[PDB]
Design an enzyme around this catalytic site. Structure first.
Site, PDB file in Angstrom:
ATOM      1  N   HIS A 174      -0.827 -21.966 -13.221  1.00 47.22           N
ATOM      2  CA  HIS A 174      -0.625 -21.240 -14.220  1.00 47.22           C
ATOM      3  C   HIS A 174      -0.374 -22.059 -15.614  1.00 47.22           C
ATOM      4  O   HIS A 174      -1.046 -21.402 -16.639  1.00 47.22           O
ATOM      5  CB  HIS A 174       0.463 -20.249 -14.312  1.00 47.22           C
ATOM      6  CG  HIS A 174       0.462 -19.296 -13.139  1.00 47.22           C
ATOM      7  ND1 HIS A 174      -0.333 -17.912 -13.509  1.00 47.22           N
ATOM      8  CD2 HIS A 174       0.408 -19.115 -11.969  1.00 47.22           C
ATOM      9  CE1 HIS A 174      -0.372 -17.002 -12.485  1.00 47.22           C
ATOM     10  NE2 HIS A 174       0.049 -17.832 -11.352  1.00 47.22           N
ATOM     11  N   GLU A 306      -6.107 -10.025 -15.861  1.00 49.80           N
ATOM     12  CA  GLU A 306      -4.943 -10.881 -15.802  1.00 49.80           C
ATOM     13  C   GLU A 306      -3.737 -10.175 -16.365  1.00 49.80           C
ATOM     14  O   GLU A 306      -2.655 -10.074 -15.695  1.00 49.80           O
ATOM     15  CB  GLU A 306      -5.005 -12.091 -16.153  1.00 49.80           C
ATOM     16  CG  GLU A 306      -3.793 -13.094 -15.985  1.00 49.80           C
ATOM     17  CD  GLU A 306      -3.937 -14.479 -16.312  1.00 49.80           C
ATOM     18  OE1 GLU A 306      -5.170 -14.767 -16.850  1.00 49.80           O
ATOM     19  OE2 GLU A 306      -3.136 -15.327 -16.238  1.00 49.80           O
ATOM     20  N   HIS A 321      -2.486  -7.006 -13.777  1.00 47.66           N
ATOM     21  CA  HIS A 321      -1.980  -8.076 -12.572  1.00 47.66           C
ATOM     22  C   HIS A 321      -1.010  -8.359 -13.034  1.00 47.66           C
ATOM     23  O   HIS A 321      -0.043  -8.293 -12.042  1.00 47.66           O
ATOM     24  CB  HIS A 321      -2.852  -9.317 -12.762  1.00 47.66           C
ATOM     25  CG  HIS A 321      -2.325 -10.332 -11.864  1.00 47.66           C
ATOM     26  ND1 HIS A 321      -1.432 -11.174 -12.604  1.00 47.66           N
ATOM     27  CD2 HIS A 321      -2.554 -10.730 -10.862  1.00 47.66           C
ATOM     28  CE1 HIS A 321      -1.187 -12.129 -11.357  1.00 47.66           C
ATOM     29  NE2 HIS A 321      -1.553 -11.954 -10.464  1.00 47.66           N
TER      30      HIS A 321
END
Lengths: 626, 313
Positions: A174, A306, A321
């Site tokens: 990430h 996302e 998400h």
């Protein structure tokens, strides 16, 4: 020197919890700092939540903005005093990874920085207790393994879910591709980040599924319905920072509205996304439509799903998400009247441990799959590499075509993360899955007159279903996990290509400990990904079973000339781990869609039928040793 | 490890058929087998015939001679390619059984290695046919039992005669005690092999007789007279290796000389062997007489009768 630089960075990372107490007479002087400091220190930082991400982005920008490395250290030193610590680690790591000045530099270990996230409450406590119990320089060792009654079979998976390496990787990934990433500000852009987002998460799910099957469990089911109650999970993690821990979640609660977002909106974003797939276009803010092109489509979808800053429309499509993580994380106290901390789902370091993670990610993966479904299948033309024939593949190990897996004990040093006091070191002992080293030997016949260049792609897929032995390639697509991708040159005539498991492109060869880093090695000096990212090596293959579970070993060779992109980038840098990580400041090195040939629908009933001449399947066994 | 060793042996055994075709850029590369392997597959390998046995013995010796197990495999890799396959299985099995290096190791199933010998041509054909008929991973199962107009009562015995286990045993026994066995070369000797030869075969006959009686049939009578015609038998076995099968034998054949041996030469031998029995001594090559001692007698006779390399004459 670089070494000195490394030294300066490590202390940015030390005693983060303690670093609080601002000791600042006024922030006004720090004009740069004005934007950050909203989130309170003790509070838990959410990787998913938008507001938290915004603060984090603001922090990174300041770090990026720093004129020179020295300036970088200074603001960092000062910022760390005020800002929430979690946000700080996040912002700094991003800065270290990207900022050139940091052409020097690993980041201190996540596990090592926050040992409490990696190890259970008990062994945190014992070590701390032993430290106080008898003051003495002597070292303390604690075995995390415990003793308890295992009533839930999910426990079996713990070796995978709980693995330290896996959690660390997720954190690092990430960081390399932040959701907040704004290409205009940085100037540089992350190639195919949306697609990578899709691929990495899909692989985690796929790998997870292989574990369940190895276990004899069925494949995970997607969390399609918002209404259904979730399975409970108790992490047993404490936060050394304050008096709290990640809240556990008991069994059978449905998802509830948060002040920040209604579950309604979740449903809606996901209906909206589905429409846009089928209608074959998405609507931009401008209200223009952009086509879901074959080339572009996954990337655009990834950003929206996302969602990243890159999303073509946030106001319509939302951030499905991320909200999912947030909603699941505070299921226990949606209202936050309780003032309880969020669960593991809130953090990239912890989230993999909860079994819910897979359910949600499969759900999102499904979204991508629908898009993939819209695409046409691959012709022989696309797959085949003519003139090249794969004669056979063999895996060499102690016993040929069998890989052995066992559990290995390991120790983690707490001292950098938690206050050591008198003790020289406090180590916690844990166990993880591991496998014997092995090599592959592929015999290829190069019919052509001239030398060819091929990309060898190797995947592993389970042979057995839950019903009986059925190599149905359509289903296999979900399951296939990527072992390795590499370039080889073939001369005319027969050739044998040997590759060792150690070389695997998917895995991180080594993560340097804060201790190693205390000296100064020469893998080279790039950053948060350095030793961190990459999938962990022990993890490369599924556990299998004592019986020796059967897995299909798939090797495919493709024309490298087609596969590679041309351009002019760097020296040999963090490229070990290209398969899941990508390359530093470089375009993704493979033209093919990630997961190719597996990404598109397969017409054939059996996998064997699918094979072209430049493909091959060898059945091998994985046997676990108790 | 032993397990690895087992794995190596199994492939020596796989596709005995297909591993013919020299596959050797200079076909002199196994000179040790330019001599042995004077049987090309054309006729079948005979366990009984002397010339065939001689080749087989030559092969085993090389295998025994192999310095180490790895060397053993290498011989068995490269050599298999030339020699007749049947001879090869025979030589290798003997080697595996005796050679210490092989302190590891079963031999792949005879029934499994040559399924065609165990099951009828029809079933084998069907399986092969089903394989081609519809390509599919799916398994094929064929029931060998058939349906047939049984005229002969001998058919009743088929459960005994046709039994897979019995045939396999007979194969194995000859391997443990080869006729060709030369104790000097190996160094070790097979204790009482001649007597065992006698005992094992006698038991097979005895057991057979019990089946006939169970059946209500009379006991089998010996082939005392060579003149008498034989009863016919059709095996219905095919050989997968090439186009052919074991030839059947129709009813009623009187005895014919072969180029290799005249049936009269045979009759002499029977007279001779039985002479010496009465005379209580046999004549060695040296022309010395050895007594048919109570202890030794069966063994000496066994070697002569079979006859093994051990035969005194």
């Amino acid at each position: 020197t670089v070494a000195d630089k490394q030294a300066r960075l490590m202390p940015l990372f030390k005693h983060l919890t303690a670093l609080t107490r601002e000791k600042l007479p006024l922030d006004q002087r720090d004009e740069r700092l004005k934007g950050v400091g909203i989130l309170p220190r003790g509070t838990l930082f959410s990787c998913f939540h938008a507001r938290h991400l915004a603060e984090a982005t603001e922090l990174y920008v300041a770090l990026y903005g720093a004129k020179d490395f020295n300036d970088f250290i200074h603001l960092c030193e000062q910022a760390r005093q005020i800002v929430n610590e979690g946000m700080f680690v996040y912002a700094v790591s991003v800065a270290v990874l990207h900022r050139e000045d940091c052409k020097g530099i690993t980041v201190p270990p996540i596990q090592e920085v926050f040992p409490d996230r990696f190890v259970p409450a008990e062994t945190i406590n014992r070590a701390n207790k032993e430290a106080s119990n008898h003051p003495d320089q002597q070292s303390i060792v604690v075995e995390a393994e415990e003793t308890g009654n295992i009533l839930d079979p999910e426990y079996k998976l713990s070796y995978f879910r709980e693995d330290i390496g896996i959690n660390a990787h997720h954190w690092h990934w990430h960081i390399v591709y932040p959701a907040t990433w704004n290409p205009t500000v940085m100037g540089k852009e992350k190639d195919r980040k949306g697609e990578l987002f899709f691929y990495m998460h899909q692989q985690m799910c796929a790998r997870y599924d292989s574990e369940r099957l190895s276990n004899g469990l069925q494949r995970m089911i997607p969390f399609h319905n918002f209404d259904e109650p979730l399975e409970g999970y108790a992490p047993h993690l404490t936060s050394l920072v304050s008096g709290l821990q990640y809240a556990s979640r008991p069994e059978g609660y449905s998802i509830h509205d948060l002040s920040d977002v209604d579950v309604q909106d979740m449903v809606r974003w996901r209906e909206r996304i589905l429409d846009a797939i089928n209608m074959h276009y998405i609507v931009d803010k401008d209200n223009n439509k952009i086509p879901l092109d074959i080339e572009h489509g996954t990337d655009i979808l990834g950003d929206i799903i996302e969602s990243s800053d890159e999303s073509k429309n946030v106001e319509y499509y939302g951030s499905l998400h991320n909200w999912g993580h947030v909603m699941m994380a505070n299921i226990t106290d949606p209202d936050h009247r309780f003032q309880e901390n969020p669960g593991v789902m809130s953090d990239t370091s912890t989230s993999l441990r909860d079994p819910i993670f897979y359910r949600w990610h499969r759900f999102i993966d499904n979204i991508f799959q629908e898009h993939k479904k819209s695409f046409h299948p691959y012709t022989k033309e696309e797959l085949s590499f003519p003139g090249v024939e794969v004669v056979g593949v063999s895996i060499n190990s102690k016993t040929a075509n069998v890989i052995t897996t066992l559990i290995k004990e390991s120790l983690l040093e707490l001292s950098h993360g938690i206050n050591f006091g008198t003790d020289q070191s406090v180590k916690v002992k844990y166990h993880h899955l591991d496998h014997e080293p092995f090599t592959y030997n592929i015999v290829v016949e190069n019919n052509s007159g001239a030398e060819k260049h091929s990309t060898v792609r190797i995947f592993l897929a389970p042979k057995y279903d839950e019903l009986n032995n059925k190599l149905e390639p359509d289903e296999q697509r979900r399951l296939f996990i990527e072992l390795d991708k590499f370039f080889y040159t073939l001369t005319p005539g027969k050739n044998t290509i040997v590759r060792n498991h150690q070389d695997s492109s998917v895995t991180i060869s080594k993560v340097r400990t804060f201790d190693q880093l205390g000296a100064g090695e020469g893998v080279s000096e790039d950053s948060t990904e350095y030793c961190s990212c990459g999938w962990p090596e022990h993890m490369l293959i599924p556990r299998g079973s004592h019986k020796g579970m059967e897995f299909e070993l798939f090797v495919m060779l493709t024309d490298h000339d087609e596969d590679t992109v041309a351009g002019l980038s760097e020296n040999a840098v963090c490229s070990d781990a290209v398969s899941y990580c990508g390359a530093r400041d470089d375009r993704y090195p493979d033209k093919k869609a990630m997961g190719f040939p597996f990404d598109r629908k397969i017409e054939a009933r059996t996998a064997a039928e699918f094979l072209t001449p430049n493909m091959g399947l060898t059945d091998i066994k994985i046997k676990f040793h108790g």
